[PDB]
Design a protein around this ligand. Structure first.
Ligand SMILES: [Ca+2]
Ligand SMILES: [Ca+2]
Length: 432
């Protein structure tokens, strides 16, 4: 049984199925869980999940208190309910996250330390309630560094991925490799729901929805200020609505991706049909980011009626580089109010820094960019309105900037290079 939620957009968008869970509650204390943050509740949570799924589904409930746990592995038809004043406290002991599981790390498929909340090929999975996800960060802060053995592991992963070595031979949870695990990583799932809860820090990517089809993300209060902490990362996913969330980030708010180079070309699964509305960025560098990992294709993305009241680097930022191939098509931003920004819109087709020297270019393939649309945007103060840097070998096409007003411009209005069919309509600015 399902409701369906209708979503308006400038492209076709099917209504989104929302599972109605069976009215059954599996309390983790009935399977041996103990609060206070020192008893390890990994096994109790797993036993509650097994019983719920065997019964046909329902809620696995974490009541008020602090509950220490290792990873939580979903099965189908489970809603993990965090009650008000519940805190899931995750351990920072790497051995609790073994054995390794199938995942994707910075756009390359591999086996790594289990994500803290992990779902693989499930249907009808949810996290809900007014409680909090709160990982311990001690060990993971140490793993922010990039010493020699960590660089060796990144090279190993990239070489295997780039030469089509089977994913099971990409075993990364070994020795000092030190690839940090995701907070939420849902992989190849159908009918996802995330509703109501708080996030306080994350070891790696905060909310990773990877190769998923159909879902809703709403009423979230996300705060994470460590390394590689975007608010939400959609990767090779489709048919999602995001609404009514707040983002307070070390990096960007909403980011759309589709993997890195050859490994992604192999998977051939674009990220598409995602709508974001009524959201708010409080801290962070970018409101809507596309890429740099876009290799599988990105198409039909719509953000509207959102705010960024404080200060950002780039409000709308589209990125790729010469290794990526793929395409970026039909990206829309509408009805956004901004405080301060360095750029309102930027397109940069050669963003390559950390991976520039570490590994080689196996193949140059220039990304096709077509249809980037910004309408009804205000910014109080900007260094520049927009800056577009295309590749001469395959220029960017069809960019529209319309009903855009900037209260004060500090450096320059615009700079354009290797872009065709740029349409500016009713742009207003002031400058001195
Ligand atoms: Ca790079
Ligand atoms: Ca690369």
């Amino acid at each position: 049984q399902y409701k369906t939620v209708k979503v308006k957009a400038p492209f076709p968008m099917q209504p989104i199925k929302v599972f109605i869970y069976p009215d059954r509650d599996f309390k983790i204390t009935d399977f041996g869980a103990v609060p206070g943050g020192e008893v390890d509740n990994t096994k109790a949570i797993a036993a509650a999940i097994d019983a719920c799924n065997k019964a046909g589904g329902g809620r696995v409930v974490v009541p008020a208190g602090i509950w220490l746990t290792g990873p939580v592995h979903f099965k189908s038809n489970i809603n993990l309910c965090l009650e008000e004043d519940a805190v899931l406290s995750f351990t920072d002991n790497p051995e609790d996250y073994l054995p390794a599981v199938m995942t994707s790390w910075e756009g390359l498929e591999c086996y790594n330390y289990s994500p803290l909340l992990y779902a693989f090929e499930c249907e009808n999975v949810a996290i809900s309630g007014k409680g909090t996800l709160q990982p311990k960060m001690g060990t993971w802060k140490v793993w922010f560094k990039r010493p020699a053995p960590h660089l060796q592991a990144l090279k190993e992963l990239y070489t295997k991925a780039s030469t089509n070595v089977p994913v099971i031979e990409r075993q990364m949870a070994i020795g000092e490799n030190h690839l940090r695990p995701h907070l939420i990583h849902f992989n190849r799932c159908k009918n996802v729901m995330l509703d109501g809860f708080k996030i306080r820090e994350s070891p790696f990517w905060t909310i990773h929805l990877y190769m998923c089809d159909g879902g809703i993300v709403r009423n979230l209060d996300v705060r994470a200020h460590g390394h590689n902490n975007d608010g939400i990362d959609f990767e090779m996913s489709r048919n999602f609505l995001v609404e009514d969330c707040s983002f307070d980030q070390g990096d960007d708010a909403v980011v759309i991706k589709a993997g890195r180079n050859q490994d992604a070309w192999r998977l051939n699964t674009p990220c598409e049909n995602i709508v974001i509305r009524n959201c708010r960025i409080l801290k962070g560098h970018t409101l809507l980011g596309i890429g740099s990992e876009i290799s599988g294709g990105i198409r039909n993305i719509y953000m509207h009626d959102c705010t960024a009241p404080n200060s950002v680097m780039r409000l709308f930022f589209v990125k790729t580089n010469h290794r990526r191939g793929g395409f970026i098509e039909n990206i829309y931003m509408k009805n956004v109010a901004s405080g301060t920004a360095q750029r309102v819109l930027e397109i940069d087709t050669e963003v390559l820094y950390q991976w520039k020297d570490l590994v080689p270019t196996y193949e140059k393939r220039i990304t096709r960019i077509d249809g980037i649309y910004m309408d009804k945007v205000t910014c109080e103060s900007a260094d520049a309105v927009y800056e577009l840097k295309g590749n001469a070998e395959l220029p960017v096409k069809n960019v529209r900037i319309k009903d855009v007003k900037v209260g004060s411009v500090k450096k320059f209005v615009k700079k354009v290079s290797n872009v065709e069919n740029v349409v500016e309509k009713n742009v207003t600015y002031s400058q001195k």
